[PDB]
Design a protein around this ligand. Structure first.
Ligand SMILES: c1ccc(Nc2c[nH]c3ncccc23)cc1
Length: 273
């Protein structure tokens, strides 16, 4: 019965993603996020199997919701005359990885390893579901502070996964691969692995490695913090200039630096509590 299934709390944030509100599902008191996007402001449109015109974001979110919990799940959506309203899961207490790094600086490698591992599992889930995120960065990762579990958010720059070339990109430039910069061409998986190398450097160094196009294209990685040789190796592998020189997800997860990861709860007990 209408939107009246939800009680609206404080605004959490607004930007290119729309305006996102804290809220509660009235029926079972479940914490939710309520995201409003103006129709006039949506660029990418898709279609539901049912045969309904929706934002591509809804299509992607629908394809990745299910048992696995590495992605923030879409629970419901509504169409208003001038906007779409999306009902998403809300961990509590929560902090996004960007704010976590801002507050705590470079992460100890054991913590970075646990977080990176969970991000890998989430991205693998997306790809298994036929979805490319295209905007993997610390701002799009939430930490369930109590369970030590990470969750991917914001599929508004996403696309269906395909094996052919992409020639369009609307994600974050400083996380985008040299092939995008030089040629306006990339393939989904190798571009994702590039963004994961930027994210891993970000975790262990406290900031992203590249600010300018020239630095991305040069691809030379300098460490500003003490970082193990194994971790540096993995980062530099993910950041190979030639897309085909980058590791697959299997290769990343089998890397020496990724061995003996902590469980989420263990991570929380050691690093978050
Ligand atoms: C696009 C889609 C969703 C979000 N935020 C959130 C979903 N769930 C949340 N829970 C806490 C804080 C923020 C969010 C941001 C951009």
């Amino acid at each position: 019965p209408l939107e009246s299934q939800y009680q609206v709390g404080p605004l959490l944030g607004s930007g290119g993603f729309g305006s996102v509100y804290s809220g509660i599902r009235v029926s079972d008191n479940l914490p939710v996020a309520i995201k409003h996007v103006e129709k006039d402001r949506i660029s990418d449109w898709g279609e539901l199997p049912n045969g309904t015109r929706v934002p591509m974001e809804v299509v992607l979110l629908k394809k990745v919701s299910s048992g696995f919990s590495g992605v923030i799940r879409l629970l419901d959506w509504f169409e208003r005359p001038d906007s779409f309203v999306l009902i998403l899961e809300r961990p509590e207490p929560v902090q996004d990885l960007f704010d976590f790094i801002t507050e705590r600086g470079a992460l100890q490698e054991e913590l970075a390893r646990s977080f990176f591992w969970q991000v890998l599992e989430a991205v693998r889930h997306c790809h298994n579901c036929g979805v490319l995120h295209r905007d993997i960065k610390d701002e799009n990762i939430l930490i369930d502070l109590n369970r030590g579990e990470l969750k991917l958010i914001d599929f508004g720059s996403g696309a269906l996964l395909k094996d052919t070339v992409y020639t369009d990109f609307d994600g974050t430039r400083v996380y985008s691969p040299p092939e995008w910069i030089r040629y306006h061409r990339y393939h989904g998986r190798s571009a994702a692995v590039w963004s994961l190398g930027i994210l891993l450097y970000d975790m262990v160094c406290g900031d992203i490695p590249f600010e300018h196009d020239e630095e991305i294209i040069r691809g030379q990685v300098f460490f500003r913090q003490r970082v193990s040789s194994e971790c540096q190796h993995l980062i530099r592998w993910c950041l190979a200039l030639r897309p085909s020189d980058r590791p697959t997800f299997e290769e990343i997860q089998n890397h020496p630096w990724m061995q003996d990861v902590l469980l989420p709860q263990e991570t929380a007990e050691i690093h978050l509590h």
